[PDB]
Structure 1
Amino acid sequence: ANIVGGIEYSINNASLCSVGFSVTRGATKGFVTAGHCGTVNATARIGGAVVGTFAARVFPGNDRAWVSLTSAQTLLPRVANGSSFVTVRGSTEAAVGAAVCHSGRTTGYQCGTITAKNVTANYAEGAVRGLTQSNACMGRGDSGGSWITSAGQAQGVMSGGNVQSNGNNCGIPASQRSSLFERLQPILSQYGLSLVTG
Structure 2
Amino acid sequence: VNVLGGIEYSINNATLCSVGFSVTRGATKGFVTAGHCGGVGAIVRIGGTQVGSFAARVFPGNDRAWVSVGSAHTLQGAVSNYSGGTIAIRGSAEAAIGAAVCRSGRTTGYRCGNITAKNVTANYAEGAVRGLTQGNACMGRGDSGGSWFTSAGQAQGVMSGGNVQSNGNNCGIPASQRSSLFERVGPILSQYGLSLVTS
Report the TM-score range of the alignment, normalised by the length of the smaller protein.
over 0.9
The one-character-per-residue Cα deviations of 1:60-116 (angstroms, maximum 9, x if unpaired) are 000000001110010011100021110001000000010000000000000000000
CA distance in 1, matches of 2:173, 2:69: 38
Q: In the alignment, what sits opposite 1:76?
A: 76
**Where does 1:58-97 land on structure 2 (aligned, <5 Å)?**
58-82=58-82, 83-97=84-98
- Counterpart of 1:180 in structure 2 is 181
Name the structure 2 match of 1:159. Answer: 160
Take 1:173 and 1:66, find their aligned partners in 2: how far apart are those partners? 32
Report the Cα offset of residue 173 of structure 1. Answer: 1.4
Q: In the aligned structure 1, how far is the partner of 2:3 from the partner of 2:47?
A: 11
Over residues 140-183 of structure 1, what are the superposed CA-to-partner deviations in whole Å (9 max), with x where a residue is unaligned? 00000000000000000000010001110000111110000000
Per the alignment, in what secondary structure is the counterpart of residue 29 of structure 2? strand
2:49, 2:105 → 1: CA distance? 20
Identify unmatched segments of 5+ residues in structure 1.
none
Aligned to 1:33: 33
**Distance in 2 of aligned mates of 1:52 and 1:72:** 10
Shift of 1:47: 1.4
What displacement does 1:48 show?
1.4
Q: Which residue of 2 aligns with 1:191?
A: 192
CA distance in 1, matches of 2:29, 2:174: 39
Deviations 1:26-64 (A, max 9, x none): 110000000000011110001111000100000000000
Q: Return the alpha-carbon distance in structure 1 between the equivalents of residues 98 and 30 of structure 2.
A: 31
Q: Secondary structure at the match of 1:31?
A: strand
Structure 1 residue 43 and structure 2 residue 43: aligned? yes
| Aligned-pair CA distance for 1:191 | 0.2
Q: Percent of aligned pairs with the same residue?
A: 82
3-state SS in 2 of match to 1:169: coil
Q: TM-score normalized by structure 1? A: 0.99
Q: Output one character per residue of 1:128-151: Cα deviation in whole Å (capped at 9) or x when no partner.
A: 000000011000000000000000
Aligned to 1:119: 120
Per the normalisation by structure 2, the TM-score is: 0.99
Cα distance in 2, alignment partners of residues 142 and 48 from structure 1: 18
Total equivalences in the alignment: 198
Whole-Å separation in 2 of the counterparts to 1:51 and 1:136: 29
Letter in 2 for 1:55: A
Distance in structure 1 (CA, Å) of the matches to 2:115 and 2:47: 33
